[model samples]
Target: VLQYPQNKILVLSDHPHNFLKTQFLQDLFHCSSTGISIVKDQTWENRYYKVHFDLYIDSCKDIPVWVEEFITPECEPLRNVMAGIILITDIRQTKPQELLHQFMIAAHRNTFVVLVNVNEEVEQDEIDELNEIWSNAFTNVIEFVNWKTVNHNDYGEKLGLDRIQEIIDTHDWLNCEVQP
Candidate 1:
């Protein structure tokens, strides 16, 4: 069983289609716990343990607002109390470095920043370059391929949720002090 100290996970992607995949991953987390029910609005609660988790998606078009609300000085306390995951889909965008810098600053030490590559358009050399850039910025850089299929089960397999869980399991949940 996967147990997380924090309950908020943010999924980001530059392409719009990946939001479907993000919802799929969110459903996986929700289904992991038994006796699950939506208590109020977007909050999901587990009846077995009374624990809750929230999933946030930044459709890749709202980085400015996302940063202002979540990463700014006023949101430091919000950052401190929340522990979760940040999934970035398709890092080959025109200006990835800027977004990566913002996320790197706001993310909790315990939070996992997963860099997903779902596009076949990216060349191997380009992938390597992007990997190098992302690897330097985040502690974890996960790559997912062949997930563009229509079948949900096949998509899940391609998405490599097991690998993600492994990363979470191995990571030491640390304090959320912003890194320099």
Candidate 2:
């Protein structure tokens, strides 16, 4: 059984490829039988997409409570708001200074932040720099390297779903308790 604090999760990345991975992870959360459900909140819309569903984890004690999922490329509106955040980036591209700043501002004090490197071209020096930058902003920084491939399905293998599951399962919900 996996447990998590009831709070909003934000998946931030600048590349389209990163979106594919985010979508896959979203589907995993929605389809899993781990006492989790995706609730559609039609009232909210972000820059390029509307949040299709809000996640809910029900332990069957009573009513199911609502949790949040913000998996999009846009990071401005959600800046300094999400409790759990995953940042995907290709170090070869432009630096994510603005996004980093926003994440630092919005993320909870106990937020678990995972940095996924989507570019294999990213050298160790760049990774060290990223670590240095992120270490200062986030309480917990997890680094993962995923190289892009020709087939989208390769994403699942390259970026293991189990790794993502671990992050979700291990997140601390900033002391927000969910009623069963």
Candidate 3:
């Protein structure tokens, strides 16, 4: 397995300040090697959480900007290079699915869409349903990663390694390689 510096990690937030203040993120990258985290409060109803080094954070705060800057403007170069989009929002939000579709039109056909439910009441069936939605939309996968448990040693041992591997495999964006 390959291990990369935290600097290679990218974070896209609807609220950069709030996400920067997050305890989980603070711990992961604070004392570690340098990494870049981009937070943008974009126009979409659903907040996004993207990983990988090259993913772009569309910072438009309104629809007109999204259309002008992204859809109809110079952002066309990024249309097919995106590796994935991760949605980070509360479980109560009702419009994430729709917002994801809107972003999809500007993303590469193979881009993955993941939904991360920060709230405690996430349901398995809901995740399954979203996975189905993503399956039909793009070459993607839908999974959830809990912030509270992300750093736990037991959880990390079981899920973190795989999580790292998944990102590396999906985008070829890691700095080091992991050996079996």
Model 2, CA-based lDDT: 0.45
In candidate 3, which residue ranges exceed 4 Å CA deviation? 1-10, 20-72, 142-147, 150-168, 172-180
lDDT of 1 by residue, 22-132 (tens): 554555454332222222223333222223356555454554555666677786655654445444455454344555677667766556666555565765456446556
- Report the alpha-carbon TM-score of model 1 versus the true structure: 0.56
**Candidate 2 collision pairs:** 39-54, 80-105, 80-106, 81-106
**Candidate 2 segments whose C-alpha is farther than 4 A from its true place:** 1-6, 26-81, 97-99, 123-125, 140-163, 175-180
Could you give candidate 3's per-residue lDDT for residues 1-180 as a string of tens digits? Answer: 233222222234334323532433444333221233453321111123243243333222333334345454476445444445554455354345555655666655555555455665765456556656565655545444443344323334323323533543555322322233
Model 2 worst lDDT window (10 residues): 59-68
Against the true structure, what is each candidate's TM-score?
0.56, 0.47, 0.53
10 residues in a row with least lDDT, candidate 3: 40-49
Q: Point to the candidate with the largest TM-score.
A: 1
Q: What is the alpha-carbon lDDT of model 1 when measured against the actual structure?
A: 0.49
> Clash number for every model?
0, 4, 8
Task: Flag the better candidate by TM-score, 2 or 3.
Answer: 3
Cα error, residue 147 of model 2, in Å, equals 5.5
Residue pairs clashing in model 1 are none
**How well does model 3 score by local distance difference test?**
0.43
User: Model 1, residue 25: what's the lDDT?
Assistant: 57
